[PDB]
């Protein structure tokens, strides 16, 4: 009877330890993938290497574990702006290559997604496609056209 009791205790301990081994293996695989992506490069996966736009992580040694010092990129101050998806210059609709059209109330600029860098609406950062009567919302403006003043 003492034998069968001791075997029952060892069997339940072995089952518990093997379940903890499975959990530790899952956590180890997650930590290895996190190291190989966030640490050994920059990961495009959003909200995987911390809250925000991930830059890099600094791994540090831990007793029976590992920690990651992620470097994120979160915006702090934002400003409201009036935007338009296209610009009608001469019947040709201008669309931004990488930015977005914004206006401060009087004039219009094009700025990047995660930072406010106003620039003059020019040909180098815009491309034309089709006619003007194709977008439900469009506004009238002009293009700076950096070839016209230099040919004179």
């Amino acid at each position: 009877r003492l034998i069968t009791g001791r075997l029952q205790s060892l069997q339940t301990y072995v089952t518990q330890q093997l379940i903890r081994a499975a959990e530790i293996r899952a956590s180890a695989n997650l930590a290895a993938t996190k190291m190989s992506e966030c640490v050994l490069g920059q990961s495009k996966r959003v909200d995987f290497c911390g809250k925000g736009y991930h830059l890099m992580s600094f791994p540090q040694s831990a007793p029976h574990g590992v920690v990651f010092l992620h470097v994120t990129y979160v915006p702090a101050q934002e400003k409201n702006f009036t935007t338009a998806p296209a610009i009608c210059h001469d019947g040709k609709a201008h669309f931004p290559r990488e930015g977005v059209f914004v206006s401060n109330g009087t004039h219009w600029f094009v700025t990047q997604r995660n930072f406010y860098e106003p620039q003059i609406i020019t040909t180098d950062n815009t491309f034309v496609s089709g006619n003007c009567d194709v977008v439900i919302g469009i506004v009238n403006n002009t293009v700076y056209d950096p070839l016209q003043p230099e040919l004179d």
Binding site: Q8, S9, T12, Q16
Partner: protein, 49 residues
């Protein structure tokens, strides 16, 4: 029956800690999926999208 359970009280201690472990592990599962944001964003009354 309860007098003879004291010889196996350690087995129930592992079991109650296991079931409590699953129950608290289950409560945390809903927190890791649905509670991604800490601010409730209200739906705007304008439905013109």
């Amino acid at each position: 029956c309860s007098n003879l359970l004291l010889q196996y009280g350690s087995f129930c201690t592992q079991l109650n800690r296991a079931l409590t472990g699953i129950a608290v592990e289950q409560d945390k599962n809903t927190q890791e999926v649905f509670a991604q944001v800490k601010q409730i964003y209200k739906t705007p009354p304008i439905k013109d999208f």
